[PDB]
Swiss-Prot record:
The gene is gmk. Belongs to the guanylate kinase family. It comes from Mycobacterium tuberculosis (strain CDC 1551 / Oshkosh). It comes from the Bacteria. This is Guanylate kinase. The lineage of its organism: Bacteria, Bacillati, Actinomycetota, Actinomycetes, Mycobacteriales. It catalyses: GMP + ATP = GDP + ADP. It is found in: Cytoplasm. Keywords: ATP-binding, Cytoplasm, Kinase, Nucleotide-binding, Transferase. Residues 2-182 form the Guanylate kinase-like domain. CDD domains: GMPK.
């Protein structure tokens, strides 16, 4: 049976890098393909980038308990979420599964699939995260303050997760995640 790992963290401690490294390291890793009700962009392939479904069908899936989690995107322009069945089928086939979501999505997945392993990717320090959020300083004081407040709230509840991987260095953080996925 394949492990299911749920990767989350602060909304900007940086995850598309770690995900890329993980997919290169584990040749048959299944990266969960979310359902959405927006339309495809040119270049997007149904079943690969998203599972493109229509608003009516998505509501069916909600009511039948077929989403591990879902949310309204841009205040309800459309919806996106994680489908239970592909994840369960991949795991029963023996293939490891990675789900990458925001913190609210990860909290919801722990309820619908408790055997999933939740991992919070933390920064090596507060000062490290703060420097990245100031960045080049092209954002106003009010926006930066709001991002610093948001990060503190999100960091303060890393205890709800099963595992904390501290992102000190790409190669060791990615190594720790490989151990969880195929160990
Ligand atoms: N909770 C939930 N949100 C999702 C899911 N997939 C994508 N989203 C959100 O939809 C938004 C925009 O999607 P898009 O611009 O195509 O690229 P993305 O941001 O990397 O997913 C992001 O804020 C995501 O957090 C999902 O499976 N579940």
């Amino acid at each position: 049976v394949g492990r299911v790992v749920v990767l989350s963290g602060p909304s900007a401690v940086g995850k598309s890098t770690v995900v890329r490294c993980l997919r290169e390291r584990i040749p048959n890793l299944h990266f969960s393909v979310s359902a959405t009700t927006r339309a495809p962009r040119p270049g997007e392939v149904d079943g690969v980038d998203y599972h493109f479904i229509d608003p009516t069908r998505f509501q069916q899936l909600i009511d039948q308990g077929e989403l591990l989690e879902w949310a309204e995107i841009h205040g309800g322009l459309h919806r996106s979420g994680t489908l239970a069945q592909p994840v369960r089928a991949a795991a029963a086939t023996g293939v490891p599964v990675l789900i990458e979501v925001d913190l609210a999505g990860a909290r919801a997945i722990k309820k619908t699939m408790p055997e999933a392993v939740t991992v919070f990717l933390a920064p090596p320090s507060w000062q490290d995260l703060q420097a990245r959020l100031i960045g080049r300083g092209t954002e106003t004081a009010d926006v930066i303050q709001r991002r610093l407040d948001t990060a503190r709230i999100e960091l303060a509840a890393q205890g709800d997760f099963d595992k904390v991987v501290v992102n000190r260095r790409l190669e060791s953080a990615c190594a720790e995640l490989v151990s969880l996925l195929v160990g």
